[PDB]
Design a protein around this ligand. Structure first.
Ligand SMILES: Nc1ncnc2c1ncn2[C@@H]1O[C@H](COP(=O)(O)OP(=O)(O)O)[C@@H](O)[C@H]1O
Ligand SMILES: Nc1ncnc2c1ncn2[C@@H]1O[C@H](COP(=O)(O)OP(=O)(O)O)[C@@H](O)[C@H]1O
Ligand SMILES: Nc1ncnc2c1ncn2[C@@H]1O[C@H](COP(=O)(O)OP(=O)(O)O)[C@@H](O)[C@H]1O
Lengths: 743, 482, 131
């Protein structure tokens, strides 16, 4: 039959739209504006309007949450799209709210919720349904409890809405629309496409796995910093596929009594065994199952070995998925990562700059922002925040906007009128106030992201640009030729050249070009675990790179550890080998299937140990030269991305005066020259403001005098004093080493 | 404790039985790792039950442990666990056999080459290849989901027998798989053959004179009180093929090869106790015959040489450990030791002693004739460079190390990769003007390797080993010779 | 533990209340400093009671500690102690203000210059100026 299709979630809300492909309505004798009847399980009907969609397939129909709930269906089910464009106008409607949504509101609900909802919409409604109205500050849901004529009626400009009466008590057959779903997660697009592909089949259709006779998953281990939304992925998955989410907690298992804690785990799995396909979420796993050597007592060894014997007791019967959430995947007892136990592992990292914008647009959906807040600006200047922190920032910007309006609501009553709530608005002033007294919780944590540096951000050195393009893109984009021949693509590249020539900019630019993650380990960080702290740290940094393939690992100032060895004593020479020895031990173990590129930068190429340089490891030596004159017309231009238009600045004239410099110092000269210009404008406006003491708003009205212009006569004055970083001994020391390597 | 007492009860009254104690190191750990008292009761409750197995029924008891180090040493006496069997991870031809067992039930299509999937999945254990076969059927039913959409509780048989599994699904299941072995000592018979290396036939013969006959013709060695040499030390210029020689002979005699690298030697050189040297040799004992290999054994000595060298007290630790349990070898077991070094002056005369490794075979720079053969061996991939006239290669570039010759051709083919890339880049951008105007089917120039690029590639060569380095080896060679 | 469970019980049926846990580092020390088992039961009995506040009558809970290093780091997540206020020792003009509070009841003679006593007593906290 050409009626039964599959359903999927929506984007543009609009509780009365469904998306269908053009040929579907064409072959189903359908036209625009034709109301349709949708019928599903439990003999429920919902009336909607149809409209075209650009990218809708024939067999898939896109619809939002509210329409799905009315039909009593879920994702990927079948529906009837039986059409009938014949509905007689309703005469009088009776719409009443649900009890547990209008707590302490009162007021006239008709003219602040329903009035702007039905206005010029001609919404077709059916008896018994539920719809959700985004209020001024809350989300109030109503229930059409009576209609005339019953039951099909379309809201007309001339009806009688009777919104008077006590709220209806919540029934037992509902989804409780004000609960979590797939549309309530942001910044986790990739991860939520893995927990959803490996869990929907055992939970949605269980009977298939019995006939096919294969092994279902039995454990998923989500790890990440606290507050990033781990228990919300498990609550969202359970609510949409249909399951029996049964949470057991970390702290309250560990603190029940003596030996009665185990009887809490043993009977926790019992409900999940006799209550349909269930899902168990063991929050804070590291609190009850730590490493063997951190278990100093005996009753902490009884609980762990009581958790292992229950997991191995899950052999078929009902389908029971058990997920756990832990902070650091190193602290979990290594006897749990075996087979038949937690084996599939998912990583939920901190959000990136385009992720923090999406958390903002989720939490602020209920509020009514003023027309001066640009969420892009608040998104990009909050680095170091996790998902849970941006849910407190958007709350403080609301309490402040009601704090400055308390006079209108002076003591009010026990119930606050809904008219004043819809009059409120939050501005950018409140948000800047909420950011001040906020303490981000991520801060010191290895950030994995795609840097935004473009090729144009670096001037010159195009010969190196082609060379590095060879070793990265082609081995991964055109592998068939490399499949032929026993070719071994280079697994590393080493940079050596004069300091401040832009080595870090080259590695960053490539990750942006190939669109791969970037991870940077600095020098002083590399010597952090060099002393005292074990070499266990140098492991996960490679596992961190391994899981995030593709990526471009970067080592900055590799020779720092060797420099410490060189000295009066250098007692850490063997210790300096410890960090080194682990590096080669955990570099020759990478497989060709996964791709990881290692780039190391150094500035004393004669002092690196010969062990590092060897075929099979990072071995391509590239010498980054000093920018040659003409290159500076591109380096100094790279600092004109600000607005220093100094009249007839004549950058060509400015190009010739600069001779034999480096790349880092040239950036300084632009900053140093600008600093004088900024100060000079201050003495101008200081002169301008103290001149206003004589004429009151009569002669001097800031007639564009000080103004950001930047002047040529201010630019050269700083250039007179400049530190030429071109040390003749140092540059010569590199070139003869370059010739020695060359010959 | 009453669970163990009533576990051996059935086995004593229920016919010839066999008991299996899984995860033994979880209930019988090392003595110092036992801190409580209830975990000192279980161990001594297991020990009194094993000694009570005096005839009656025939009860065999096995136990499975991950690492024999961690088991309480009291379970090694006689009358207790005494016979030990080692189940190592499968090798390259083993993993092809696990695949054909689990895929026996499925219905593979006539395009999957299980040998290709077997040889490229190093690092997997037996249990891991069972998950790989499971997700190659789940993926191949997820794509036919339309035909079996919901249906009913029971699935028709014909729709099952219409299935197939292709190479695409197997390649898909490989991506989201994490092998669990990885960082483990790999011990197996290498596949390197004599012909893989060129030249050095004099040393090629000599190695056969030292290892082969002392185990195939021992009757003549029974006559004369001969103590056959237990160790051989290779010394020469770096990058000359010492490792290749040790790999090849292990293949010729068909003995397991165990390799120890320099950084591995420095892992326990600091801090960690010398118990790491215990099982390194004990792995050799059980896997007899085997050819242990020590690489860059002078790295520890070189670390001592420096501004301070405070690890000199640490330096004698490992050398003592190696020396202590290497004069204790027995002629009954056949364990052979081979060492390699490139700075023979720094190694302490102590290891250079009769009764230990004492044959100092000098590996010279590759011979003029050998330089021709080295080129052919490494260039057996597909370097058809028309009329290449490769005999030019050796003579112009004389006095070159073996490892350098491999590098110079890897770079030469590297540029040849680039030319083929622009070859089809030109073709594809020329194809933008002619829409599918190809009467004959051709996509690429089909690797037409020329000769002109090779000489152009030679321009960036490197004289790594110089006259200064080679002189030092020869004068020390004459020092030993005279 | 049963004393903590009945301490939050009364605060739930007795109007907007505020609970003050004095000397927090005596009952919730660092995890590595916890050696026994009954001192790992108190901490985890405190943690499960904070998370059980179901938008209550606004039972605010405040705690006092000497050094924020010594508090078990589990009491810093969201939904638990997150806002932190620092009460430093009084300065040279602060100590003059403590004097005029405590000496308010007494009857000073017209020769005492409290400013002279305020600026001399560096090293005193509020409690020492009451003695
Ligand atoms: N898209 C999102 N990603 C991450 N966190 C979110 C998102 N949307 C909301 N949150 C907030 O993250 C919190 C996660 O709940 P919580 O259990 O406190 O942290 P965790 O889940 O890390 O243990 C929720 O309180 C929710 O307000
Ligand atoms: N295109 C460029 N060419 C040369 N130098 C540049 C360029 N762009 C920026 N720089 C300068 O290079 C500096 C970056 O130095 P970096 O390479 O990280 O130090 P190091 O060489 O010690 O690793 C920046 O401070 C910047 O001023
Ligand atoms: N017949 C040969 N003689 C010398 N070198 C060879 C020969 N065949 C290959 N090689 C190259 O010489 C290099 C020597 O490496 P290897 O023998 O493993 O350790 P070492 O560098 O200590 O000799 C190998 O990487 C190999 O590519």
């Amino acid at each position: 039959r050409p009626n039964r299709l599959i359903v999927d979630e929506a984007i543009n809300e609009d509780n009365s739209v469904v998306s269908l492909s053009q040929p579907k309505m064409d072959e189903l004798q359908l036209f625009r504006g034709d109301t349709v009847l949708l019928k599903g399980k439990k003999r429920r009907e919902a009336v909607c309007i149809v409209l075209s969609d650009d990218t809708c397939s024939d067999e898939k129909i896109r619809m939002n949450r509210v329409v799905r709930n009315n039909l009593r269906v879920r994702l990927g089910d079948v529906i009837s799209i039986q059409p009938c464009p014949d509905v007689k106008y309703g005469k009088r409607i009776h719409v009443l709210p649900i009890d547990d949504t209008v707590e302490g509101i009162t007021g006239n609900l008709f003219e602040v919720y329903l009035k702007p909802y039905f206005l010029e919409a001609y919404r077709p409604i059916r008896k018994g349904d539920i719809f959700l109205v985004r209020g001024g500050m809350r989300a109030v849901e109503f229930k059409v409890v009576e209609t005339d004529p019953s039951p099909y009626c379309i809201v007309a400009p001339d009806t009688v809405i009777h919104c008077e009466g006590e709220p209806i008590k919540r029934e037992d057959e509902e989804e409780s629309l004000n609960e979590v779903g797939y549309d309530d997660i942001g910044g986790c697009r990739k991860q939520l496409a893995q927990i959803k592909e490996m869990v929907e089949l055992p939970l949605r259709h269980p009977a298939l796995f019995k006939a096919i006779g294969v092994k279902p998953p039995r454990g998923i281990l989500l790890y990440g910093p606290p507050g990033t939304g781990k228990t919300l992925i498990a609550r969202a998955v359970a609510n949409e596929t249909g399951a029996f989410f049964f949470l057991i907690n970390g702290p309250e298992i560990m603190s029940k009594l003596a030996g009665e804690s185990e009887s809490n785990l043993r009977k926790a799995f019992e409900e999940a065994e006799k209550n349909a396909p269930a899902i168990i979420f063991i929050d804070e796993l590291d609190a009850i199952a730590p490493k063997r050597e951190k278990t100093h007592g005996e009753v902490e060894r009884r609980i762990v070995s009581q958790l292992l014997t229950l997991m191995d007791g899950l052999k078929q019967r009902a389908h029971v998925i058990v997920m756990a959430a832990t902070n650091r995947p190193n602290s979990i007892d290594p006897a749990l990562r075996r087979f038949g136990r937690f084996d599939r592992e998912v990583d939920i990292g901190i959000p990136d700059a385009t992720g923090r914008l999406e958390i903002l647009q989720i939490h602020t959906k209920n509020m009514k922002l003023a027309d001066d807040v640009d969420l892009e600006q608040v998104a990009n200047e909050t680095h170091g925040h996790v998902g849970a922190d941006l849910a407190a920032l958007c709350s403080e910007a609301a309490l402040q906007a009601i704090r400055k309006k308390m006079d209108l609501i002076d003591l009010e009553d026990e119930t606050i009128d809904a008219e004043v709530m819809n009059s409120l608005a939050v501005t950018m002033d409140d948000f800047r106030w909420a950011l001040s007294q906020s303490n981000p919780s991520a801060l010191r944590e290895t950030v994995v992201e795609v840097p935004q540096v473009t090729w144009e951000d670096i001037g010159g050195l195009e010969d190196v640009k082609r060379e590095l393009q060879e070793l990265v893109q082609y081995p991964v984009e055109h592998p068939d030729k490399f499949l032929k021949f026993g070719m071994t693509p280079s697994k590393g590249v080493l940079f050596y050249g004069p300091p401040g020539c832009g080595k870090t900019l080259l590695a960053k630019a490539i990750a942006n070009e190939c669109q791969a993650n970037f991870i940077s380990i600095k020098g002083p960080e590399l010597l952090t675990m060099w002393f005292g702290e074990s070499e266990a740290n140098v492991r996960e940094i490679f596992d961190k790179a391994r899981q995030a393939a593709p990526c471009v690992l970067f080592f900055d100032e590799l020779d720092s550890i060797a420099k410490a060895r060189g000295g009066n004593i250098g007692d850490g020479g063997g210790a300096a080998d410890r960090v080194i020895n682990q590096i080669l031990t955990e570099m020759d173990g990478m497989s060709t299937k996964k791709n990881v590129f290692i780039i190391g930068a150094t500035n004393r190429p004669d002092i690196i140990d010969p062990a590092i340089l060897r075929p099979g490891r990072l071995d391509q030596l590239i010498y980054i030269p000093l920018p040659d004159e003409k290159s500076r017309v591109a380096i100094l231009k790279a600092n004109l991305r600000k607005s220093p238009v100094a009249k007839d600045v004549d950058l060509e004239f400015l190009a010739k005066m600069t001779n034999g410099f480096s790349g880092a110092d040239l950036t300084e000269i632009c900053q140093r020259a600008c600093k004088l210009a900024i100060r000079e404008s201050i003495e101008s406006e200081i002169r301008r403001e103290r001149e206003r003491q004589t004429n009151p708003s009569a002669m001097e009205v800031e007639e564009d005098d000080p103004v950001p212009e930047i002047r040529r006569d201010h630019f050269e004055e700083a250039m007179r004093f400049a530190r030429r970083s071109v040390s003749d001994n140092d540059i010569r020391k590199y070139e003869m080493f370059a010739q020695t390597l060359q010959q």
